[PDB]
């Protein structure tokens, strides 16, 4: 592999792993469209299983990018419109605060303060209906962004209703299969369990627990190869043969809202390239990423901008993931780790690598 890539990756990631005490890590760099892979450490410390290119990691909220694209694909199929009221797809949602809340608001965290998490107490479908019916918005729709699993998770569940497919069936048939992501899963099958890394939290081996809207908000597991392929697909959607999927990918990178120097897509978030690295590095810190922020509507949304830093962070209890790419440069990176370590360290390392190669 080109020595420049080897050197920039190893010189950045080796110290990262040491500083953050990350048990296992995989990195893919997409350079001029081609992937290059790097692995370190352990998928399972107790069983001495190394990280390989076939190791599954929990993506956490990087799953939101799959949800956004699947939603985009449903728009392209004509099954849903982002302008459609939430109640069109969930008629039981009769409470008056839902008047004016559209699928766009759900997809982009702008419904008016839907909470970061669905309460753990919500176990049944009746529980979920009660939760949304009883929720009281802090703000009018389309005025403030508050990053939330309960927002985009509901979008994902509603987006697949017209198809009649379960969220998982829709994801597999309409996104995973066409892109040949054959080692990407919402539920890890028994056949693949030998490859499923443990996450590590406070030294304990952990996997994500079941929760409401988990598949839709944070539930995808994948390998570094499949994730490199996901980045390639999002870098160059025009190479994708399935028309509605190609279109869905483009819709997910459209710019719907602006807050500061960031633009909200469907799942993806974007900044203009060249970026100010302090802006994305500091902006990734949950102190900022999870805050309530006023948004400016982009009316109408700007289609995907090639000169963008497009990215998403993800975490579960035991895992930390990051994906970033720059379409204009045919350049991208995926970093998957089995420890949830601070976001700014992820973005700093990714920027150091992509900047050196650009």
CSV table of C-alpha atoms in Angstrom, one decimal, residues 1-15 29 36 38 40 349 352-353 356-357:
chain,number,residue,atom,x,y,z
A,1,UNK,CA,0.0,0.0,0.0
A,2,UNK,CA,1.3,3.5,-0.8
A,3,UNK,CA,3.9,4.4,1.8
A,4,UNK,CA,2.3,7.9,2.3
A,5,UNK,CA,-1.0,6.3,3.4
A,6,UNK,CA,0.8,3.7,5.6
A,7,UNK,CA,2.8,6.4,7.3
A,8,UNK,CA,0.1,8.9,7.9
A,9,UNK,CA,-2.3,6.3,9.2
A,10,UNK,CA,0.1,4.5,11.5
A,11,UNK,CA,1.7,7.8,12.8
A,12,UNK,CA,-1.8,9.1,13.7
A,13,UNK,CA,-3.6,6.0,14.9
A,14,UNK,CA,-0.8,4.3,16.9
A,15,UNK,CA,-0.6,7.2,19.4
A,29,UNK,CA,-8.8,5.0,4.0
A,36,UNK,CA,-6.7,0.6,2.2
A,38,UNK,CA,-5.4,-1.2,8.8
A,40,UNK,CA,-4.8,-3.2,15.5
A,349,UNK,CA,-7.2,11.9,13.9
A,352,UNK,CA,-4.9,14.8,10.4
A,353,UNK,CA,-5.1,11.8,8.0
A,356,UNK,CA,-2.2,14.9,4.8
A,357,UNK,CA,-3.6,13.0,1.8
